[model samples]
Target: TRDQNGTWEMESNENFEGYMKALDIDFATRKIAVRLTQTKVIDQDGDNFKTKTTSTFRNYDVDFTVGVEFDEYTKSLDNRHVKALVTWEGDVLVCVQKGEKENRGWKQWIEGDKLYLELTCGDQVCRQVFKKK
Candidate 1:
């Protein structure tokens, strides 16, 4: 797992609102996300772990042991609190966003010294890269 000490804020957060809109997220629901300081916090404890995402507006937490998959709810997007789950592929952590859209979700990895993230919504996909802080 990874730690929250170094984080990549979504600067050019591609179409997050559009993605949510496709899921019926209203204008007010989409309005404040960009203003949020979204934080991805992860901690690994000898294969057991805790991960949390916190922001001024909302927060989400996860507790799991690696290699095991569990259901997750994305409380922020549509705020319907849809269920999602994440798993690791090699050194990359992959999430399958299992509601609302076709071929939806995200994948995260590290390339050289940078963090690479990919987000999907319907047929649209956006890529974001993060340099180590």
Candidate 2:
């Protein structure tokens, strides 16, 4: 099975500032956010999952079930309210956020001992890779 239940530390982050800019984040916050090291803690049970993204600057927690839509309020990141749906596309976990932003969402997948995350908003895409810890 596609087991993604563990702690992962970021090893590489690309274009994160561009992704933040696409989200309309301020220049000051984007500067701090782009430099912070992030960690992903994931817990999964069947189709239900809880994921947490943590950094020294901020942390975000999200809970959802596959194929179910839930209300998500981006507290520190943009502070926008959106309806989010998470689904399994093959082995990849894909989330689509429905709100004012066009083509806003993320995708996650495990490859070998590395976990990859792709965040997209408008025309910007941020790619991050995490190593299992």
Candidate 3:
């Protein structure tokens, strides 16, 4: 069962531009996202979960069930259609997105009271750490 539910505020980001560039994000969007402050909201209900990425410039929200593959539209982020599936790698929640891009996915887990996210695309990976807020 998913007991990980919280609101987290971004603390730091690493190699975010490289990850975004791998997705072919435009210069303007990438520029805005470079300094973008994202707030992550997660609500877990057993195996089903709802997640939202909130920022002043853009926002994206999605909901899905664990182990079930569903169509995911990453509006404002990459504007791509992908088959997304969430599975547990031990206690860590790992997301695998099958799309035109290679090695595209993200992993989320908690360390202490901090939420850690690793965004992957191609050979580039971005690590974002957020503190519970």
Model 1, span 1-133: residue lDDT tens = 3433444454455667778888887888688765576666666666666667776644666575555656666565655444466888999888776766668778899989999999988889899999998
* Index of the highest-lDDT prediction: 2
Residue 39, model 3: lDDT of 89
25-122: candidate 2 lDDT, tens digit per residue: 99989877887988999999988899999885446887789999999999868999999999999999999999999999999999999999999999
Candidate 1 Cα misplacement greater than 4 A, ranges: 1-65
Instruction: List the lowest-lDDT window of 10 residues for candidate 1.
Output: 1-10
Q: Which model, 1 or 2, shows the larger TM-score?
A: 2
What is the Cα-based TM-score of model 3? Answer: 0.58
Candidates sorted on lDDT, descending: 2, 3, 1
Query: Please, what are the lDDT tens digits per residue for candidate 3 over residues 51-95?
Result: 998885446777899999999998767899999999999989999
TM-score of each: 0.49, 0.58, 0.58
Compared with the true structure, the alpha-carbon lDDT of candidate 2 equals 0.92
- In model 3, the worst 10-residue window by lDDT is 54-63
Instruction: Give candidate 2's root-mean-square deviation (CA, Å).
Output: 16.0
Runs of candidate 2 exceeding 4 Å displacement:
1-58
